Amino acid sequence: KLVRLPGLIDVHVHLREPGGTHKEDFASGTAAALAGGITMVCAMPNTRPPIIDAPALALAQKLAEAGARCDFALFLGASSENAGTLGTVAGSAAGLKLYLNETFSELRLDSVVQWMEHFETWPSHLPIVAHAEQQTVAAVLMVAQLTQRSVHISHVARKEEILLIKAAKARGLPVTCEVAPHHLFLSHDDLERLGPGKGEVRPELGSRQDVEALWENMAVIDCFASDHAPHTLEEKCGSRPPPGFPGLETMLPLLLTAVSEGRLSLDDLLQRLHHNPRRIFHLPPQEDTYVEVDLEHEWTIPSHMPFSKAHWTPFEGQKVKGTVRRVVLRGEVAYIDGQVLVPPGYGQDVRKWPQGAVPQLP
Amino acid sequence: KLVRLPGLIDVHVHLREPGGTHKEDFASGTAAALAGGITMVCAMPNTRPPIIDAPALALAQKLAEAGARCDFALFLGASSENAGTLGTVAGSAAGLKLYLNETFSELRLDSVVQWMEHFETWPSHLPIVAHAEQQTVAAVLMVAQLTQRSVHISHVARKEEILLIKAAKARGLPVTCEVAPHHLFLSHDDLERLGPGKGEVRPELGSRQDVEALWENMAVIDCFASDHAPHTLEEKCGSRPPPGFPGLETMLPLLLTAVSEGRLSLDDLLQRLHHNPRRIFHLPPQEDTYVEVDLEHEWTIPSHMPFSKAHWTPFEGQKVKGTVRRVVLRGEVAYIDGQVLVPPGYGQDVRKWPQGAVPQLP
Ligand SMILES: [Zn+2]
Ligand SMILES: [Zn+2]
Ligand SMILES: [Zn+2]
Ligand SMILES: [Zn+2]
Ligand SMILES: [Zn+2]
Ligand SMILES: [Zn+2]
């Protein structure tokens, strides 16, 4: 007996095209998404070149329209030079992303005043997402309050962070957040196995106490999202390993395992991978779209999943219960039992759908 | 013709007793204060042992009562273990100090949740001061808002910081701040002369643009305070130089020079070294207390000032106009032309004066 789920949404993926296509591209990353039961993804802007101006966005849109196998929206990225310049293209993006901790030169903001400038100039009705760790979460919350608008905090990883967000919500502040599977299912205890290279991720893996705090505060978590951040094994195992884990193909099986163990309900899962992503990012429904999963199938995660070009996984050896059997996307079979059956280019930019525009006052 | 000023107050000094008395002690540091026209000081808690519990405060109070030549109040310091434990002694302190960036093990807070715990437990009517740089200013402002109370930000040093505080004040938030003389009168341009050891200070010296921003935003600055942070030349010039500059003896002459040049008025100076310190920290008046200064005397700052045991100064070679001629403290001549004339122990704990208790609801 299969369970039918709606089309799941991952609001935080790095698909590496343009500029890092040995790590992943739109075609491989969206194949990974479909195999993980994900029918819509929001792609981050830290590509090469990064998506920080209209021409880069235009290029990315065409690459995605030509390569994506599932539907998508593309983020713009905040830079030290582009505040006040994105107004005409802002509505065509998933939202604006601010990289407030480590990142490359082009996306680095050197002052909180630059954060404020973005919050002041980006259209008030459109999403803003921050990569913000530890005290940076409090700092960007302050900027959001000074500018009287909302903010979404990516990949909350620590007890410190989830409790701060909990306190902000208790004061009625408009903040939402997401948690990634590696911060629910891996911890410091796994660093021995992973090693210092493969184990490199930002936010870093937390303590057992951090992991337990995220589970205990599930009510505070609005979304799950993978932070799919593919890098090859050569890169992860080399002299200056980049941070990040691939995660599209493993996210749903890990979470289904947790549902089977009664750690959260099926509804808790669907709020966090479907309804809340829709409502926070104003993402449209997908007609005739659904995912069929088998909740009884027990398997062990292998050394690499079939589709991501990362060709490794930090969850290797974990036992899971739950697997994606079939995905239907807009009336076409997109995935069955290990085979992707829609071509590159089948996917569409949801921000171009009439129902995918974010409502605003005239 | 001498100008009579009221007794000036420095709300931010490190007097190093107990535990660092080769760098300074109460007797030498308060001699330096008097020579700088300062009749009341608030001493920071990062001594050895640090002032983080009632017994350490009791010791510090007696050392100060025995050694101080001017009047004083003593800060308590926040630790990872003392939130909720300081209620009985809190009112006897200048306030509570939080070290939110670099500091030693005992005063290190590892989580914003610990900041929140202090803001929640420290009596709401008593001062809280934070060492907070760059985004940490925004973060502690957020904590202050979540807990619905005020905060005072020490030594603002950057354009980024003063503009953030300016924005917070424009939203009506209860925040005050201070600036130290080295951030008004020194910059990156001086690092060549000072070298990497002597030049070490936290917050670090700013760019010319940082300095210009602080002057342009003088209206946002509530207090001046020295952050007198004495270390010996051997320490500053050695392999792991501690951050900090001595500043009690040079602060007023530097600022009087600026008054003479019309960079700020005498009133602007007295608001920031007398009236605002009084009102932010609820410090009592000092009867029959005043400072006589000569505004016409031109001199060059030497390689060390007479009183601080630091025995060096980063302002060496700067030309100033303005000098302290006489100080009278509670009806006794305390300083004349280079000679301190009150003994160690003349100074008193102002929090023990009836007028020095902070008013509170019953
Ligand atoms: Zn991130
Ligand atoms: Zn990311
Ligand atoms: Zn539903
Ligand atoms: Zn400080
Ligand atoms: Zn200090
Ligand atoms: Zn006055």
Swiss-Prot record, chains A, B:
Induction: Transcriptionally repressed following hypoxia by HIF1A. Changing residue 227 to N: Abolishes dihydroorotase activity. Zn(2+) 2 binds at residues 12, 154, 178. Activated by MAP kinase (Erk1/2) phosphorylation just prior to the S phase of the cell cycle, when the demand for pyrimidine nucleotides is greatest, and down-regulated as the cells emerge from S phase by protein kinase A (PKA) phosphorylation. (S)-dihydroorotate binds at residues 16, 46, 202, 231, 243. Changing residue 231 to N: 3% of wild-type catalytic activity. Zn(2+) 3 binds at residues 97, 131, 155. Homohexamer. Interacts with CIPC. It is linked to Developmental and epileptic encephalopathy 50: A form of epileptic encephalopathy, a heterogeneous group of severe early-onset epilepsies characterized by refractory seizures, neurodevelopmental impairment, and poor prognosis. Development is normal prior to seizure onset, after which cognitive and motor delays become apparent. DEE50 is an autosomal recessive, progressive disease with onset in infancy and favorable response to treatment with oral uridine. This is Multifunctional protein CAD. It comes from Homo sapiens (Human). The chain holds residues 1460 to 1821 of 2225 of the full protein.
